[PDB]
Design an enzyme around this catalytic site. Structure first.
Site, PDB file in Angstrom:
ATOM      1  N   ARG A  25      49.890  -3.053  44.506  1.00 26.26           N
ATOM      2  CA  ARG A  25      50.599  -3.640  43.378  1.00 26.26           C
ATOM      3  C   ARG A  25      50.822  -5.124  43.658  1.00 26.26           C
ATOM      4  NH1 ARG A  25      54.994   1.374  42.467  1.00 26.26           N
ATOM      5  NH2 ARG A  25      53.383   2.940  41.961  1.00 26.26           N
TER       6      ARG A  25
ATOM      7  N   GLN B 133      51.140   6.264  49.280  1.00 21.89           N
ATOM      8  CA  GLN B 133      52.071   7.164  48.629  1.00 21.89           C
ATOM      9  C   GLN B 133      51.782   8.606  49.052  1.00 21.89           C
ATOM     10  OE1 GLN B 133      51.949   7.068  44.252  1.00 21.89           O
ATOM     11  NE2 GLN B 133      54.154   6.619  44.338  1.00 21.89           N
TER      12      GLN B 133
ATOM     13  N   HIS C 216      50.389  15.486  41.871  1.00 22.20           N
ATOM     14  CA  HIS C 216      50.478  15.771  40.455  1.00 22.20           C
ATOM     15  C   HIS C 216      50.295  17.249  40.216  1.00 22.20           C
ATOM     16  CE1 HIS C 216      49.868  11.418  40.321  1.00 22.20           C
ATOM     17  NE2 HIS C 216      50.653  11.539  39.268  1.00 22.20           N
TER      18      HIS C 216
ATOM     19  N   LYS D  82      63.019  11.880  34.222  1.00 23.60           N
ATOM     20  CA  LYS D  82      62.774  11.979  35.662  1.00 23.60           C
ATOM     21  C   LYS D  82      64.046  12.208  36.480  1.00 23.60           C
ATOM     22  CE  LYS D  82      63.167   7.018  36.484  1.00 23.60           C
ATOM     23  NZ  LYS D  82      62.560   5.782  37.041  1.00 23.60           N
TER      24      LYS D  82
HETATM   25  C1  LIG Z   1      55.203   9.863  41.803  1.00 25.34           C
HETATM   26  C2  LIG Z   1      53.943   9.096  41.464  1.00 25.34           C
HETATM   27  O1  LIG Z   1      52.930   9.981  40.982  1.00 25.34           O
HETATM   28  C3  LIG Z   1      54.191   8.002  40.416  1.00 25.34           C
HETATM   29  N1  LIG Z   1      52.974   7.408  39.907  1.00 25.34           N
HETATM   30  C4  LIG Z   1      55.000   6.831  40.989  1.00 25.34           C
HETATM   31  O2  LIG Z   1      54.427   5.967  41.649  1.00 25.34           O
HETATM   32  N2  LIG Z   1      56.306   6.813  40.728  1.00 25.34           N
HETATM   33  C5  LIG Z   1      57.156   5.675  41.055  1.00 25.34           C
HETATM   34  C6  LIG Z   1      57.271   4.694  39.928  1.00 25.34           C
HETATM   35  C7  LIG Z   1      56.285   4.001  39.406  1.00 25.34           C
HETATM   36  C8  LIG Z   1      56.435   3.028  38.283  1.00 25.34           C
HETATM   37  N3  LIG Z   1      55.365   2.012  38.295  1.00 25.34           N
HETATM   38  C9  LIG Z   1      55.456   0.940  39.145  1.00 25.34           C
HETATM   39  N4  LIG Z   1      54.577   0.016  39.303  1.00 25.34           N
HETATM   40  C10 LIG Z   1      53.417   0.121  38.532  1.00 25.34           C
HETATM   41  C11 LIG Z   1      52.426  -0.855  38.684  1.00 25.34           C
HETATM   42  C12 LIG Z   1      51.263  -0.777  37.935  1.00 25.34           C
HETATM   43 CL1  LIG Z   1      50.072  -2.024  38.119  1.00 25.34          CL
HETATM   44  C13 LIG Z   1      51.071   0.269  37.038  1.00 25.34           C
HETATM   45 CL2  LIG Z   1      49.621   0.379  36.091  1.00 25.34          CL
HETATM   46  C14 LIG Z   1      52.041   1.241  36.879  1.00 25.34           C
HETATM   47  C15 LIG Z   1      53.218   1.168  37.625  1.00 25.34           C
HETATM   48  C16 LIG Z   1      54.261   2.198  37.470  1.00 25.34           C
HETATM   49  O3  LIG Z   1      54.210   3.121  36.674  1.00 25.34           O
HETATM   50 ZN   LIG Z   2      51.633   9.616  39.139  1.00 33.67          ZN
END
Ligand SMILES: C[C@@H](O)[C@H](N)C(=O)NC/C=C/Cn1cnc2cc(Cl)c(Cl)cc2c1=O
Ligand SMILES: [Zn+2]
Ligand SMILES: C[C@@H](O)[C@H](N)C(=O)NC/C=C/Cn1cnc2cc(Cl)c(Cl)cc2c1=O
Ligand SMILES: [Zn+2]
Lengths: 402, 400
Positions: free
Chosen positions: B123, B141, B145, B225
């Protein structure tokens, strides 16, 4: 059949899409194969006294420009930007390893320092040249870099050669063609350095009684190399192994150590990979074995199955015993004929099918069938488990007899 | 002094560098901790009945635009190009997991389908905000899912909750705060979908006697959530765990299965990570223990050492036995005083230090001292290996 693309779909190992060309989606069963291959490589890394590290996925272009690969390979490199800075996604792990090496003062006592990594590499290859697991953009290299003195080169190349043949033999590859690439027209260092370096590679091969041939003028500007080409059971050539000497990169990236005479000295670098790409190697193995992966690599090693409802609890206990024994095991308790169960798991290439009828339950035994259609007979449960464990631990190409 | 940066340098675990902001160089000993943590998570994945997969590092921008994250997160994406096509380096693993789910026909009999990955995510976050292992750009991570029916949601959240508390316990984290995020203004689905979805999370927590606070309007557009926050020995809050319902991404990425009534149904997706980030969790653990990693995590578990050259062979034989028993062991045969040796490995935070004098060779025993300064005396060698093996395999927090 021996098509890894066909078999990979049939056994649900992996897939690929147009949305990510040349980059594998590993399914559960394929990722199980991958992870066991990693475990195997790690046991060799420990045996041959390698450290294992992990480096970041990207680094500043400024650093990559200093390596002296930029002009020749810039087109094959993925780049991405952030806050007015350009980063390369790593195509190789060598510069990252130098960074680790540069942390803390190094001594002659720390050499030879052998630094390995299952390194995730990306190379911006043409999309039209991509083909399954063989030709990929994203891959994982069974990589390592040895930092050593000039005097230590022969012994370290010797150890690399051994490790290569040792690892190839595990998978059933005995026919190996070895090629030693010599000095190119455009090169660094003195002629006397190239004499010693080439000689170090040749002597190391001779000491292992390995016949080889030259690849004249095919070496890199920074040093000569040995390449290892294995042959599958169809007599097809796969260049996998590489041992590359490098008298450039350490100096370019400010790598040094304190010598025995208390003077600053630049270490020699040996690049080596044995399997090459883990992905490509699995592809090769899939075709070599035609999906009949040796038990230690098989996604599902054993299916325990009952002839009728009567043996269901016996199946559950035996399944749990195999589970406790560390074996990748599944119970097939479906309301289906024993022939139907055997045919399905034979087609899925499950090494062993442990069949439980009344006479098996009564005797505390199990009827062992192989995916080759062989009936090994009714065998004592504890005895079968210890033999399966021994086949797995020794990574045997062969199944049990009887 | 429990700085993970300091301890990371001292025990040669990792470093970071300006050429790669917020991305970790894991050294031998640090990578060993990481891999053990990975092995621990894998044992739980097996126990809780998860598959394990691996998805590619990057995918097409076209696909990422279909997810509905592009307007909100395009500035946080890393993008790269090849042959006049823009590819995103993945910030999340969910879309890749759907891609795997979409291969081959799925039915109701395949659900619930739990798909885990140690997902390498990137990120693009402000470099000035980065610090240590706690705030990074590149991380791993402990993601998963769960593809399931609407009727299966409540059971699957239950299992997720149990998994969270089980795993935190392993590391000694018992003070857990829980927060349930409810429907925002900008959302999809009827109010009735959100009534059921929020109740699924609430009841699951209620039935496990977990008290929680509501977070009104802080939910995603695609669902509510639960977030889990643990507290370390300095009583600092670390939001690590998450369970996120999703009634959007599966539809958007053409996910479906054949239901029990012979018709195409869109599955519900549950996002969950427990540790959150492997790098950050290791950060937290390093500080929690102040480098005194429990024996199962310790980079070097045992150092066996002699007094004089006389006992060298016995030490090497003892070392080999410990290695065969699956213990990370190092031999120390240096011509140094015993107080020097013991100090160095106490500073390195080696759980056990096995001293071998003439008395120990002749008697078939070994003198055991802990890094906590406890002398356990001359013990039988087999007895020691067994107790070390039990401590490692049970993943005990305490030493002998
Ligand atoms: C639990 C896991 O499956 C889930 N995706 C996750 O990471 N949860 C924590 C929160 C995640 C929230 N978040 C944070 N930063 C992001 C950066 C990019 Cl570039 C994109 Cl496309 C999506 C996200 C996003 O949605
Ligand atoms: Zn996810
Ligand atoms: C064994 C390992 O340590 C070694 N670096 C290695 O990869 N050798 C195999 C082939 C090495 C040859 N090669 C191939 N493609 C590359 C693409 C890029 Cl973008 C860059 Cl910067 C370098 C290379 C490169 O040098
Ligand atoms: Zn290299």
């Amino acid at each position: 059949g021996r098509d890894h693309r066909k078999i990979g779909k049939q056994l649900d190992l992996y897939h690929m899409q147009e949305e990510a060309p040349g980059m594998v989606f590993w399914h559960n069963d394929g990722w199980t194969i991958f992870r066991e291959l990693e475990v195997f490589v790690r046991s060799k890394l420990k045996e041959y006294q390698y450290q294992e590290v992990k480096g970041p996925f990207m680094m500043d272009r400024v650093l990559w420009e200093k390596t002296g690969h930029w002009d020749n390979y810039k087109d094959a490199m993925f780049t991405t930007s952030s806050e007015n800075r350009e980063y390369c996604i790593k195509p190789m792990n060598c510069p990252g390893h130098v960074q680790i090496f540069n942390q803390g003062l190094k001594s002659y006592r720390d050499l030879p320092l052998r630094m390995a990594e299952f390194g995730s590499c990306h190379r911006n290859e043409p999309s039209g040249a991509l083909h399954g697991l063989m030709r990929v953009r994203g891959f994982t290299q069974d990589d390592a870099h040895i930092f050593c003195t000039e005097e230590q080169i022969r012994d370290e190349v010797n150890a690399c050669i051994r490790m290569v043949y040792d690892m190839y033999s595990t998978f059933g590859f005995e026919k190996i063609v070895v090629k030693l690439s010599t000095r190119p027209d455009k090169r660094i260092g003195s002629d006397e350095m190239w004499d010693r370096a080439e000689a170090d590679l040749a002597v190391a091969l001779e000491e292992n009684n390995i016949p080889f041939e030259y690849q004249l003028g095919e070496g890199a500007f920074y040093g000569p190399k040995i390449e290892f080409t294995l042959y599958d059971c169809l007599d097809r050539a796969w260049q996998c192994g590489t041992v590359q000497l490098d008298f450039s990169l350490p100096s370019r990236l400010s790598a040094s150590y304190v010598g025995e005479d208390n003077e600053r000295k630049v270490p020699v670098m040996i690049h080596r990979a044995i399997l090459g790409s883990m992905e490509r190697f699995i592809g090769i193995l899939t075709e070599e074995f035609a999906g009949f992966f040796p038990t230690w690599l098989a996604p599902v090693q054993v299916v325990v199955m009952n002839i009728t409802d009567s043996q269901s609890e016996y199946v559950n206990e035996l399944t749990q015993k195999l589970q406790n024994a560390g074996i990748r095991v599944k119970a097939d308790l479906r309301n289906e004929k024993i022939g139907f169960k055997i045919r399905e798991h034979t087609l899925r290439r499950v090494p062993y099918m442990l069949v439980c009828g009344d006479k098996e339950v009564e005797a505390g035994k199990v009827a062992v069938r192989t995916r080759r259609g062989k009936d090994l007979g009714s065998l004592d449960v504890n005895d079968v488990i210890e033999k399966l464990q021994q086949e797995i631990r020794s990574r045997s190409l062969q199944q049990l007899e009887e």
